[PDB]
Amino acid sequence: MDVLYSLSKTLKDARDKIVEGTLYSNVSDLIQQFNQMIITMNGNEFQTGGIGNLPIRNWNFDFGLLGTTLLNLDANYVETARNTIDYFVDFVDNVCMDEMVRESQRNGIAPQSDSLRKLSGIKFKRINFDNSS
Amino acid sequence: MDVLYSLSKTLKDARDKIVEGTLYSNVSDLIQQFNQMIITMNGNEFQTGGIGNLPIRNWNFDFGLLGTTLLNLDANYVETARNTIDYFVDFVDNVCMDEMVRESQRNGIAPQSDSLRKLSGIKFKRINFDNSS
Amino acid sequence: EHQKEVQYEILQKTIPTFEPKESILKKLEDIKPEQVKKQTKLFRIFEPRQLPVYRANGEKELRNRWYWKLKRDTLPDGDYDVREYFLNLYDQVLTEMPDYLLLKDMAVENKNSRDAGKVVDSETAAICDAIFQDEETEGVVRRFIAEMRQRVQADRNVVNYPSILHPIDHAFNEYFLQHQLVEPLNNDIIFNYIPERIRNDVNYILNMDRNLPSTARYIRPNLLQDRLNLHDNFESLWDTITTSNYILARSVVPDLKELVSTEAQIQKMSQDLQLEALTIQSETQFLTGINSQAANDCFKTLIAAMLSQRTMSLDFVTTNYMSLISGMWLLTVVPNDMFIRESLVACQLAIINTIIYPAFGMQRMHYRNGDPQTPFQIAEQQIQNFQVANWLHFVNNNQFRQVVIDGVLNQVLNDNIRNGHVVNQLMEALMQLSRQQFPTMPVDYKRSIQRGILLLSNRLGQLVDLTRLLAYNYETLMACITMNMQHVQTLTTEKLQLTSVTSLCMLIGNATVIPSPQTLFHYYNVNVNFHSNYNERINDAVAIITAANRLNLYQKKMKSIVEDFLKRLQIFDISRVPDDQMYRLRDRLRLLPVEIRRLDIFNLILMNMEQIERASDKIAQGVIIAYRDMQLERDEMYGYVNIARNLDGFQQINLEELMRTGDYAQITNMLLNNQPVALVGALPFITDSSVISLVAKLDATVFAQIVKLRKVDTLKPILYKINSDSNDFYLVANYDWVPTSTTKVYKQIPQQFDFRASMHMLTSNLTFTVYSDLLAFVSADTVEPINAVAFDNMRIMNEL
C-alpha cells in the first residue's frame, strides 16, 4: 500500500518541480527517485476494473529513462516527460478507483484488487518515500 | 526556542522519509542534519516536570549514529533508527508540556522551563533548520 | 618587422598555448582514458590488537582484552594540522576511488569449521583463527565463526560473503559497493553511443558481429556541458583551446586527390591571363603555385577554422586581382561571421574598389568605409543589377546560423541548406559575374580581369562540387563533437593566402573524398576522453575546494588546486596564465554542486573526524590546570591515570587561535595569579611511570615555558601511566594513600571491541568483465567515393 502513496508524491512533486526553466540541480535528488521507479515497473502487466460499470483496461509498461546531462531544462525536455507522466496519472486514477470500491468483512483492512495486491509484493517496496501527507 | 522547532520537523520529516525501501539519495541531505543533532546533544542532561500532577522524568544522551551507506534501505536499518526516534518523541512531548504551562508576568514572551532555557543556549543553535510551519 | 615581434609576443605570454603546433596534437591522442581502479584489500584503518589490562589498583590481570587501534597513526600537533591531515585522506580516497568490485577475487579459507568456509579477506581470516583460540570468548563465538558459510548463487550473480570490518570501515567499503557506477551493455547501447546522424548517412555501412554476455559492463562517459562559461572572459585560454581543437581538426580532414596537373592549368592560364601586357608589378599573381599543396592546406585550414570555432585573417595581396575574385568565393560560403571584422575589411574594399564599381561603371567615386555596417553590404542599397544585388544580401546575411541542439546538447553553430548542396548560391554568384564585362579605364584591364572571371564560370560547373564537398564534410565530422561551441572572437588569427584558395578553386576535378570510418571514431574518442577529463577534474577540483572551506584551512585554496587542475588537463602550460585568470577561475568553481560521489564521501569523513583524532595513541586534545590537589582517577586500561573525559567548568582557549594570532597574555595573567584554565586542540604527549614524579608535581611545570618563547609547540604535557606493575616505583600501595595529581588530560579512552557489531555481511555482485574503448565492436565499411550523397540525396560530387 504505502507503495501506492509514493507513486503519487512522485508525480505531484514531478508535474510540479519539472518545468521549462528550473536548474537541473533542483531536481537531482528527485530525478533519481523517478527513474528508479520506471525500472521496477517495466515488464509487469496490470488489470484494473471488472466490476459494475467500471471498465477493464489493460496497462503495460515500456519506457525510456530520463535525462542526466542537463543544465536548466529546455522545453523539449519537459514535453517528452509530460507524455510519460500522463500515462501514469491515467493509470493511478484507474488503480485507486478499482480498490476504492471493493469491501471485505473478514479482512477489509488489506488490499483487495488484483492491481494493488500485486503492489504490496516485495519487489516494489524499493519506491516508498516522503510520507508527509 | 526556534531550536525546539527543528527538533520536530527533524523527527517528522524523519519518521516520514525513512521507510523500508526508499533510495538513500532522497535522505542524504536529511540524514546529515539528523546526526549533527545527536552530537550536539550527547553529553547533556535534562529534567522536565515538577509542577502539579506533571511527572518529573529525567533524560540523558549517548547514541551511536547512522551508516550513510547503502543504495536502498533494509528493514533492519529502520528499526534500529525508530528505536532512537521514539526516545526523542517521548522527550519532546515532555519538553513541550513543561513549557506549555508556566506563565510569567514579566517576560511572558521568553522561555520559562529549565528544559528550554537551556536550549536557547548558543551551543545548540547548530541544529536550526527548515522553518516553514 | 622586429618591432612587430616583441609585441606580437608580449601577447603570446598571455596565452597558455603550448609552443610548437604539432606538440599539441600528441598531448591529445595521448590523453589516455581514466584507469579503472578495481581493488584488492578490503581497506580499513584499524585492526584490533591485544593489550594489557590492570584492574583497579591491579597488576596485569593476566587477561588481555581486545581494543581497536590505528594502523599508521600519524597525527600532527595542533587543531589546524589535524584538519589538513584529514584533507589528504580525501585526496587519497578519490585517487583510490574503486569504480567497481567483486568478492571471489578476495575469497579465503576460514581454516576452522565444518562447512567449507570461504570468508571475505585476509584480515577477516586472521581475526577468526586468532579469537577462535582466546579461550575466554563465549561458546557462541566459535559456533558463529564455525557454521557461518558464504553465500553462492550461480544464477543472478549473487555473492554474500561473511566478513568483519568495523563501524567506520563497513562505512567506507559499503558505499563503494552501492556506487559501482557500472551500467550494463547491450548491442543496442553501442549502436546508440553513435551520433543519431551517422547511422542515417547512407554512404556509411553498419553491422554487428560480436555478441554480448549479460556480463557486459562499461563506465558512463560523463559529458555534462560547459558548466564553466569561459566564453565570456577567459580569452587567453580560448585561444589556446581553439588552437588545439584546430590542429586536431587538420589531423582529420581527409587529404584531397585527383587534381589537375599544376603545369597544365597555369599554362592555359597564361594564354587566357595575358600576363605581361604593360602593367608594372609582374609575377605576383603566379606565386600561386605549390597548389598541389596550397589547396590541401586551404582546404584543411578552412574546415578546422570552422569546427574549432576559430577566427582568422588573410595574407592578402592587393595587386593580384584574381586572388581577390576568389575572395568573393570565400565569402560566398564561409560565414563571414567567423572572420575577424578587419581581414574582411581589406578583402571586400579591395574587391569593391579595384573591381565591380568601376569595371561595372557604377560609383566612379570608388568608395569610403568607417567601422560599422560593412562595405560588402551597404554597397547593396546602392546597386542596380539584381544579380549583383542578391549576392550582397546573401553574403552580408549568411551568419553561420548559430543555433543548434542535436543528438543531445551539441551546439555546433551550423550552416544553410542553401549552401549545403542547394549550391545555387554558387550558380547565382556566377550568373551575377556573367554580366560584368564593361568600360571606364585602360584596355589591358577589362580584358585581363574578365578573362579571369570566366575561368571561375566555366569551372563553375565544378565549383559546384566544392560546395557539396565542404557541405558534407563539415556537416559530417561535426556530428561527433561533444564540447559545445559558442562563436567567439579568438585572440589569435590564422593566415590564409588567397594563393591556395584560388588554387583549390579552378583546380579541383571530379575528385571525391571523405572521412575514413576508423578516422571518424578516433575523433569522437578523443574529444570524449578530453571532456571526461575536464568534467572529472572539475569534480575533483570542486570537491577539494569546498572541503577546504569547512575544514577551516584558511590558507592554500587559491592557486594551489588550480595549478594541479590545469596541468592534468594537459592542453595548456599554466604559467602564462594572467593572475586575474587563475583567481577568477576559482571564483567560478566555488559556485557549483558536487558530484554526489565526491560530496557523499566528505560528509562521511567529517562525521567520524572527531572520533579518529581522539582514537590515536599519540596526541590528546588539550589539558587542564586547577592548582587544586586532585584525585587521580582509575581506568582498567591505563591503570592508575589522570584522565578527564570532559571539559566543563573552565574557560576554553583555542590554542590554534592564540598561536596564529599572537598572545595578549590573557593566559599569562590567568596563569600568574594561578587560575583554573583549559587549553583545547591537538597536542604532543608524555607518559611517565615515576611514582615519585607525581609527588614532585612535575605536571605543574612544563607550562611556565610558553611565555618566554612566544610559541606553544614545545608544550608536551604529562600523563602518569601508573600501573600496579611496570612501575619499579611502587612504594605506594604499601602505604595508606591517594594520588594527588594537580593536572590531567582529554584523550578519551580507546574503544573496546565488540565482535557482534563489527561483523557485517557483504553484498557484492559476481563476475563481470569490464570493457573500455567500446566502439571497436563496430563493423563498418564504405561505399565507393564516386557514390556520395548529402541531405540532398541526389549525389554529392556529381559532375561526372
Swiss-Prot record, chains A, B:
Record text on subunit structure and interactions: Homotrimer. Interacts with the inner capsid protein VP2. Interacts with the outer capsid glycoprotein VP7. Interacts with the outer capsid protein VP5*.
Compartment(s) of residence: Virion
Entry's family note: Belongs to the rotavirus VP6 family.
Region (Interaction with the inner capsid protein VP2): 62-73
Other remarks in the entry: The VP6 trimer contains a zinc ion located at the center of the molecule. The zinc ion is not essential for either trimerization or transcription activity of the DLP. Zinc-depleted VP6 has an increased sensitivity to proteases.
Top-level taxon: Viruses
PTM annotation, UniProt: The N-terminus is blocked. Sumoylated with SUMO1 and SUMO2. Sumoylation of viral proteins seems to have a positive role on viral replication.
Protein name: Intermediate capsid protein VP6
Job of this protein: Intermediate capsid protein that self assembles to form an icosahedral capsid with a T=13 symmetry, which consists of 230 trimers of VP6, with channels at each of its five-fold vertices. This capsid constitutes the middle concentric layer of the viral mature particle. The innermost VP2 capsid and the intermediate VP6 capsid remain intact following cell entry to protect the dsRNA from degradation and to prevent unfavorable antiviral responses in the host cell during all the replication cycle of the virus.
Organism annotation: Rotavirus A (strain RVA/Monkey/United States/RRV/1975/G3P5B[3])
